[PDB]
Amino acid sequence: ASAYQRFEPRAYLRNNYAPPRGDLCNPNGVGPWKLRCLAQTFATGEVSGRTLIDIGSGPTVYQLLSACSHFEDITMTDFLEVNRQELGRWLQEEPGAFNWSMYSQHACLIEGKGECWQDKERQLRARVKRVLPIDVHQPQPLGAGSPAPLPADALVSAFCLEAVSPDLASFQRALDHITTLLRPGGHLLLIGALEESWYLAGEARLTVVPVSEEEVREALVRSGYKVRDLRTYIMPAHLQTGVDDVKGVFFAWAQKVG
Numbered sequence: 719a720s721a722y723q724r725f726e727p728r729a730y731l732r733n734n735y736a737p738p739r740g741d742l743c744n745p746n747g748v749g750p751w752k753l754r755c756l757a758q759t760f761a762t763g764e765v766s767g768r769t770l771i772d773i774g775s776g777p778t779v780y781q782l783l784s785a786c787s788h789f790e791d792i793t794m795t796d797f798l799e800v801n802r803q804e805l806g807r808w809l810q811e812e813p814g815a816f817n818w819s820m821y822s823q824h825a826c827l828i829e830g831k832g833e834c835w836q837d838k839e840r841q842l843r844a845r846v847k848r849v850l851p852i853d854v855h856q857p858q859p860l861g862a863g864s865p866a867p868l869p870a871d872a873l874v875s876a877f878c879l880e881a882v883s884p885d886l887a888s889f890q891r892a893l894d895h896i897t898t899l900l901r902p903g904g905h906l907l908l909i910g911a912l913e914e915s916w917y918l919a920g921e922a923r924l925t926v927v928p929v930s931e932e933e934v935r936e937a938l939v940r941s942g943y944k945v946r947d948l949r950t951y952i953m954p955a956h957l958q959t960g961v962d963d964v965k966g967v968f969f970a971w972a973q974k975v976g
């Protein structure tokens with residue numbers, strides 16, 4: 719909470735969504751891997767509905783590129799005002815917005831529906847109805863009278879939980895807190911850092927709870943999820959850059975037992 723007060727959105731984006739990690743040309747990169755996971759999951763047609771909430775969006779939109787064409791009402795969220803402002807600069811196409819075109823383009827490449835990236839970015843901007851404050855540590859993450867339609871048909875969260883919890887236990891409770899926003903039989907698409915303990919965002923150094931695949935699986939189960947899919951990406955040497963000590967990245971497709 720206090721450590722995140724020095725969090726620099728532009729530095730975070732630069733560290734993880736600009737070359738080399740942000741160079742989507744090589745199919746073995748972490749970016750193409752994450753977009754592939756999201757695309758294939760939605761391509762199954764099993765994850766559908768009207769509303770969807772993205773937990774701890776930070777200043778990024780890539781995690782919703784394949785999702786947007788499946789839900790008409792999308793809520794983006796984040797603990798920091800600076801992030802929500804950054805998200806606004808892109809949704810409004812204001813000056814200085816981050817350029818996600820490489821991710822939009824590759825998402826279109828992977829979905830293989832012959833869509834142009836401008837049409838995809840346009841659908842996302844159109845379907846994002848609101849960017850709200852959020853605290854996964856509160857039993858009621860989005861407050862009491864939130865504008866977001868609850869319960870959501872689906873949830874998506876990337877690099878949030880493990881990046882905001884001191885240990886596994888806090889991680890477990892955080893998952894429980896956001897799981898309350900999801901309707902029974904709903905879907906959760908969780909992406910996160912494997913065995914990572916810190917990552918930089920400008921002047922801020924954030925602590926991370928190093929989690930493993932089994933620990934992530936057991937936690938989803940303990941929260942009442944049937945794990946539909948759970949994949950791991952080992953961070954290659956070329957993408958280890960000193961902005962963190964991440965070892966891998968996991969993707970989980972879990973359905974709320976209900």
Ligand SMILES: Nc1ncnc2c1ncn2[C@@H]1O[C@H](CSCC[C@H](N)C(=O)O)[C@@H](O)[C@H]1O
Pocket residue numbers: 719722725773774775776777778781796797798801852853854855875876877878881882
């Ligand atoms: N208590 C809390 N509850 C929810 N989000 C929190 C939080 N404390 C910090 N955060 C936010 O969690 C984010 C982690 S960075 C993740 C950004 C994006 N989802 C991606 O895929 O890269 C930051 O934007 C930070 O402000």
Ligand SMILES: NC[C@H](O)c1ccc(O)cc1
Pocket residue numbers: 734739748877881911916917962964
């Ligand atoms: N906390 C996010 C974590 O540092 C991270 C984010 C994105 C990556 O590609 C790799 C690692």
